[PDB]
Amino acid sequence: SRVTPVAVIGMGCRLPGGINSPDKLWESLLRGDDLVTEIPPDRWDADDYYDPEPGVPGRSVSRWGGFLDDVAGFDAEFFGISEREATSIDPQQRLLLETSWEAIEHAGLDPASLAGSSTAVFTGLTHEDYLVLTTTAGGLASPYVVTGLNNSVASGRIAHTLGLHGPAMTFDTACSSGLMAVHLACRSLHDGEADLALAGGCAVLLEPHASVAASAQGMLSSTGRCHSFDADADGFVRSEGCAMVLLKRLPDALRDGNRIFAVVRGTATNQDGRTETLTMPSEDAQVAVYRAALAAAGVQPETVGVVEAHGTGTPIGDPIEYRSLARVYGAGTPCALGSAKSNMGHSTASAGTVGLIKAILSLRHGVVPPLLHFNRLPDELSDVETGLFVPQAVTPWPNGNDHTPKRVAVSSFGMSGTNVHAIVEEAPAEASAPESSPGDAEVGPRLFMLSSTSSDALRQTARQLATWVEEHQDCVAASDLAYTLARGRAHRPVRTAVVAANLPELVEGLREVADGDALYDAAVGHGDRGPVWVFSGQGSQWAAMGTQLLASEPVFAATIAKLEPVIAAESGFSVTEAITAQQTVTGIDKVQPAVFAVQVALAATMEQTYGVRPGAVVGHSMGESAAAVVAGALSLEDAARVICRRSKLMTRIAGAGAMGSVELPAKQVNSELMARGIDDVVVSVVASPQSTVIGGTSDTVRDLIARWEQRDVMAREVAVDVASHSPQVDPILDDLAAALADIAPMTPKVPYYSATLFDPREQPVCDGAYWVDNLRNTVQFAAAVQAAMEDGYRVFAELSPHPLLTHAVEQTGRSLDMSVAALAGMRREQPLPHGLRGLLTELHRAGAALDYSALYPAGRLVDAPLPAWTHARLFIDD
Amino acid sequence: MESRVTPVAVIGMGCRLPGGINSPDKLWESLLRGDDLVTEIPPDRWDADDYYDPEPGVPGRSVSRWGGFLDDVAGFDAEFFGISEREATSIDPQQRLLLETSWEAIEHAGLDPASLAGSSTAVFTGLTHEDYLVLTTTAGGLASPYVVTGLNNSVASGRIAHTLGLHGPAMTFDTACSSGLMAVHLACRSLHDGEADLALAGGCAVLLEPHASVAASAQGMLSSTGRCHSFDADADGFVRSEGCAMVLLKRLPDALRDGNRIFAVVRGTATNQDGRTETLTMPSEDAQVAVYRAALAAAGVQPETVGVVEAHGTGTPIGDPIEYRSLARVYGAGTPCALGSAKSNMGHSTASAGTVGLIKAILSLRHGVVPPLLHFNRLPDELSDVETGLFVPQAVTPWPNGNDHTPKRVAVSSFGMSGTNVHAIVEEAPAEASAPESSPGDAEVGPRLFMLSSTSSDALRQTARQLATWVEEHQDCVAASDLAYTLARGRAHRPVRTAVVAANLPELVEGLREVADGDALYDAAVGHGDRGPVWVFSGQGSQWAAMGTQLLASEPVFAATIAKLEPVIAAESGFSVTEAITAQQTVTGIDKVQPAVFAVQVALAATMEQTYGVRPGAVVGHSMGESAAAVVAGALSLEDAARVICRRSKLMTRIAGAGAMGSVELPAKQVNSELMARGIDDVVVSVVASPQSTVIGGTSDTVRDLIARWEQRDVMAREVAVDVASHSPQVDPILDDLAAALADIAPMTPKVPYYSATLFDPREQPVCDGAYWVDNLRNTVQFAAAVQAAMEDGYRVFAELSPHPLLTHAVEQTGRSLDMSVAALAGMRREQPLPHGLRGLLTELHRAGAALDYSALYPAGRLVDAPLPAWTHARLFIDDD
Amino acid sequence: GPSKFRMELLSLPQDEWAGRLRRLLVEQASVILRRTIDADRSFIEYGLDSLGMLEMRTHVETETGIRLTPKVIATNNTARALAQYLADTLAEEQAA
Ligand SMILES: *[C@@H](CCCCCCCCCCCCCC)C(=O)NCCNC(=O)CCNC(=O)[C@H](O)C(C)(C)COP(=O)(O)O
Ligand SMILES: *[C@@H](CCCCCCCCCCCCCC)C(=O)NCCNC(=O)CCNC(=O)[C@H](O)C(C)(C)COP(*)(=O)O
């Protein structure tokens, strides 16, 4: 072997007829589809130039071509491109930018993970149609033309966008540009200049003057069809198309476990040299490049089963090529001769890569697609004795032996006389992991995860995937598909999840998402920071809260089982019946422990079963006790005593005061309270900057409420037993401190934003005096939440039985002009047949950091379709 | 110590830059003189006032009115490359300049581009901008069929490979302003692989249209002042400028083995991308530092041994401080290091400044000095904190840290707009492993032959004038013999060619001025150099008094051959050859006239082959001329043909005035019909000289009476009195004696092809026996058919080797009949002096285009930097007036 | 004299100076980018190129009298940070 083998670990393409995926390309090739259509009126009026008489000046003989369903579409915002600059960008560059992202995602890699890598980019561009259209419109004066119409930035932008550091050059080698990029990338990876390579080309047809000019040369087909290797060959038809591949050194790819589609064992390039005419090919030059590539790959030509020829369909090009192949390949052993350009026309720049992609697919499925538009070879090739043949149907691999890996030969010959050839071998024998036992493939709901750049794109994405799952539901494994959508895709800003146990169930859910009218909204996080647990106070209790979770989640049930004896120890009460009875838990000695048990088990389930690391913890009222447990400051055996011992204490002062809710800032409330000479009523909880909770003497509290109602102020009393965070609790703190004298606080390991300490940023020591202070002092919950946002957290999920502070969090975030998400872990009478997977679905939708490895330990990548795009039409105009 | 790539030697460089710079040496003179090459935009391109606006950011207007412009962009030598005028009109000028400069690069390396046919030479050409495409679509000329190759970028490199018949990889590419040096990266990589043994790298810049300036001006790139104030505190942007530059690259072990001249060694090169950093065009400091240490690692060079950095130096207020701070982090670690940038002198030659920067680096290496930076007055205050050994030279500076233990090394950098950086480390050429310098040898100062060439007459005069100026300057820096060697075996001989004979350079300067000013019409060569000339050997009538006196005194080998043949005639004819050729009166009497003509003519052909290496591709003789032709082609030995001719002249000396030669313009068929009408057999066709000229031999009275018959009928039937009526029945009685008296010779097979007028078919090999000779004095001389078969074989150059040309006019006539352009040179003329021996024939033989053995004429010598020939540029452009 | 916004802003207590600025920025970037921005996600991934940075540079100069430079927006890569950078810069010059 002359060079290092290079593995094609990812492929991406956009091709005429709506083909935008390598798997979709294979289906069309196998079906024998013909993607050559009449020129859409959107490009130009074909009848303004069509003339069947050859060589008529100013007129073309071709009215056909292979066109993309749309070209002006480009998801500009997802790449941070403003419409003003996006409009002037050559569509060839935009399609390359999009398809390169598809190529990386197809490999199972997050493109954002490639930032800072030594990845190299090689893109070939041969047509300046958008430049000419801009010149005709006279819009060259726009400053964005400097970047929009230059050819170097076609690969520069891709490297700039993804933050790559390898070579990022753009070349132009005519119709062999697509395959030349693979040869250059295979060279660069071997030299060590890079560790990953993006190779391919793009061609876009927007102007008739390119077609008529070639028509005057007699190049294009009169019948408008690339009759490759047929007697009626009369020329080619230009066609749009963009295709890219991702290349990585084989030892690295095998070491890192990336899926390998095929191995490029060696490439070679050559020039036709001096010929009769500048565009005439040379037979001996083609024969030389064949032996050069085989020598570089170190493989005998007798073992190359299938040759993917150039096959443009020119009357003189094919006989030269056919003689070239017969002198090297097909030496006795049968050989199959194919050409992708028959099915979709000549893609020019990208024709090299598309031919390669067809070769990759043929290797994987082990068959050769029939060659469209073939009846017989030209009569002048009758005497050539060779093993070559043109398949007229889906044929098995011509060799059929097992001792030798399947190999193909890919060729591409440029107009300027530059030839490219590459030898591709099938992927290595899969390093199959130990077979998954039926116990590992547990029957149970799994999250299938979607993403897109907009609401409509998500609905389109769901529809596409639903049809794909409906086809491969027997061939694909549900475990792998769940793994692939989570661990092997890029989570685009607008995202959702569908939970199901079987693929048919998954399809039905996707169709509901496809036809649903819900306004899916973009995520607010970046997966860099974990969610912030919010532990609310009392009042969220509802009848039979824990019945569903106990019957569904084992860790939740286990947590209650461990904590139940402590309640029966300190308070002598059984929480299992209270949270499962038909009546809401009542009594402070019962209400507080019941809420505490649910919250801590909810947190316990989340970071153990679903492995969600909390980025920060925020506590409100007794929720601070739950907050301490999750933060690692205390053990559950301590806070349970803290809750239980405290809970029985204010049973003495049940009814010792009344609470009021004032929807005004606390600062002005304090000033008005001071100006009124009143000092028994104090601010209890600063819930939001626009709301305040007060408590004190029951009759007096009603008096300011009436004194606020006469001022038409929105105010309300709070129907709860104990005047917490007010001087009414005074007769207990001395007893409470003695009861908590045995508490052993520890330093918190999770960021703790206490609402009791004057500075929320302080990491508390949850000693006895804290809870004494917590009950007496006011709660600056809005301040603590505000502090967490200032630190950068944006996702808050409250773990109470019912949402009570989610509205407060949203108000505080809005008061800071900050985009935040307020999720609810549980809701009153909300059925959750799938357990807490609903919250996990919501947390991912918001964008909190997750340990997807814990949810999806291992699995094989599969071919799930990539997400759609928010294709806004961005084209020049006159 | 570790070198991960093979060192690559730059064996040839060529460029075309603004201000009439057409050669690397002329670039060096400009840099030392501190020339500023940017000018106001010429009205020929566009009206600059139609777009100028000093206010930055104004829509639809450009802030700069200056640029560096080539003196002639539309100029192209279409016919030399075999491209029709129509096709060349629609070819992008970037492609046309690349084709011309690449040819200049190959010649500058000392190689004939025709010798690269079938080689594995690779071609990488950087190329940005599409101004001609913009112009073409504005004029609406895209319907032309030639556009498919004229405007497609891939043909830019494909055309070079197609023209020269190169088989290595050939591609063009775009990497913004770093494409020029990126070509060197790919070429070094391709050579390292073994894919190629020669590589052309470079780029082209062309500035035909204004909107490119307007679009960039809105972005704020364009400099308001109009000069690239590289590394100056007043930097405000760059200025675009035209320019093309190409280099030729070869593996260093191969360059040493073949003995090619090395200008510099590219030890290593590397490239990378800036990555995600602010805006698309904002450069990254850390990326620049990475490529420096990567290139050094690949080249195995520590940075402290690099003394000069050819920085990118665009002149933007953002780019320059990033460059300086990045360089100070790598280079100049305590040791002084000199900064520089070719951008300052000639603006930004986008997509080619990478190569132009490289070329400046090589010239600095060979001359060992750092050119001053033009507009530098003070570094920006932002860089006052940076501590470094770097410094910007304000005058011609000796090489920093100059020493012999460490070879001089240069770092070349070039950064593109897309963010792709290229950086290469260049070392001086290895210590000259030349032959003993000024060693004794061919120290003779005899007049040497200096060769000129071009594509047209007016081009030759321009070429002579340019070379005359160059020789006038370097008359002391180089030896005359080396210049003669360079022009002969180190250049490509274009169709229009001539030579000048001189003994010393001062005479040469006078000679070129005569050629540059003379109104001589220099016709292009008719030969392709494939086949050697065809010697022509004549009959009687060429003799004149004291012919060889000057030749005997000017060609020692001629004299040796004359002396060699002297004894045999002194035995067979009894008289010394020097008598007839040195007497003050013309030799008379066939017994001495005939041997004398044969003796000189044989030595003449001997003089060409032994002394001037002129191997004849074919040989043709006439009458007596077959004897001389037989010796030269190898059909018979030298002395044996001598006894052959003296015996004949003596044997027919028995008769005087045996008959007559009626020479008529009538065709042989027509005179045969006329003779049949006359019915006499006393006269016979003796010589078929031309299709429009026939010679009739026979009895005197039958000739004289009958030739008057055409003279009454107004027919061009002249005759000059001759001693012998050969090829006629008048010599028949002596043939029996002649058939045996000279039968002692032993003919053998010629080693050279022979066309014989004696045989019916000249192409047949003639056995030079007496019977064949007896045919010669009797059979009709079929000379016209003899030369006809020669040109049917494609031979083109015919030289008449006779004291006076007699049959040359016949060659032109038959060539005119054949509609086939041929050369009819004459070896020597009547009374014509020979101040330089037969060198006057050789210069004409070269001008005709025959095959020559230049190795024999020019055994050895070092190549020189003599200026390349000027092109016949024609104004080819697209107009929308 | 200075823009009407600058008179109002200084007359207001300095603690909301970030809040009022954080809007002069959101509105101005919204019209420049033609997209309702958010106050925390970075400009560069909105597509704020070098030109748009100039339009921001000149506009804030008219509205606040502060000479912004393109490196600063490159450093204060988000609106909240940029408004924060404007706040103390206003505070520092005021204290002079
Ligand atoms: C790719 C060809 C790419 C170039 C032509 C299509 C694009 C539009 C024109 C270029 C841009 C113009 C400027 C902007 C508007 C390709 O695959 N081509 C065919 C490859 N075949 C091949 O090389 C051999 C085919 N050649 C011939 O059949 C033969 O040379 C001709 C019939 C074409 C010419 O014959 P003659 O004129 O007698 O030499
Ligand atoms: C050369 C840069 C490219 C010059 C030629 C561009 C001509 C237009 C090409 C497209 C065709 C349009 C016409 C179609 C008919 C170069 O040498 N690049 C390296 C240095 N160049 C830089 O830009 C580096 C310094 N950059 C800057 O100063 C800033 O990024 C600029 C001023 C560009 C933007 O400032 P803003 O980001 O603060």
Residue numbers in the entry:
A (entry chain A): 3 to 880
B (entry chain B): 1 to 881
C (entry chain C): 2011 to 2106
Could you share sentences copied from the article?
As exemplified by isoniazid, which targets the enoylreductase in mycolic acid biosynthesis, mycocerosic acid synthase (MAS) offers a potential drug target by producing part of phthiocerol dimycocerosate (PDIM), a key component of the cell envelope. MAS, a fully reducing iterative type I polyketide synthase (PKS), is composed of six domains that together catalyze the elongation of n-C6-C20 fatty acids to prepare mycocerosic acid. Using a combination of dual covalent crosslinking and cryo-EM analyses, we elucidate the structure of mycocerosic acid synthase from Mycobacterium tuberculosis trapped in two distinct catalytic states during its iterative cycle. These structures reveal domain architecture of the acyl carrier protein mediating condensation and dehydration through dual site-selective crosslinking of the acyl carrier protein with the ketosynthase and dehydratase domains.
We also obtained a density map for complex B from the same dataset with a higher overall resolution (3.22 Å) that further elucidates details of the condensation compartment (KS-LD-AT), with only one ACP crosslinked at KS. Complex B revealed the homodimeric condensation compartment (KS-LD-AT) with one ACP crosslinked at KS via 1, while the other KS was inhibited by 1 in small molecule form (without ACP). Covalent bond S-C between the KS active site Cys177 and the reactive α-position of the crosslinker, as well as the O-P covalent bond between the ACP active residue Ser2060 and the PPant arm, were determined by continuous map density. Interactions between ACP and KS are limited to a single hydrogen bond between Arg2045 on loop 1 of the ACP and Glu79 of KS along with weak hydrophobic and electrostatic interactions. Complex B reveals that the docking of ACP on KS is mainly facilitated by interactions with the neighboring AT domain via hydrogen bonding between Arg2032 and Arg2033 on helix 1 and Arg2090 on helix 4 with Asp819 on the AT domain. In MAS complex B, the crosslinker, tethered through a phosphodiester linkage to Ser2060 of ACP, has the PPant arm forming hydrogen bonds with residues Thr279 and Thr281 in KS. The warhead carbonyl of crosslinker 1 coordinates with two highly conserved residues His312 and His348, trapping the transacylation (substrate loading or reloading) state of KS in its gate-closed form. Supported by continuous map density, the C16 acyl tail of 1 is buried deep within the hydrophobic tunnel formed by the KS • KS’ dimeric interface. In terms of substrate chain length, it is noteworthy that the two substrate tunnels formed by the KS • KS’ dimer in complex B are connected, contributing to a potential substrate tunnel sharing to accommodate C22-C28 mycocerosic acids products. In complex B, MAS potentially adopts KS gating loops similar to E. coli type II KSs, and the presence of key gating residues is essential for activity.
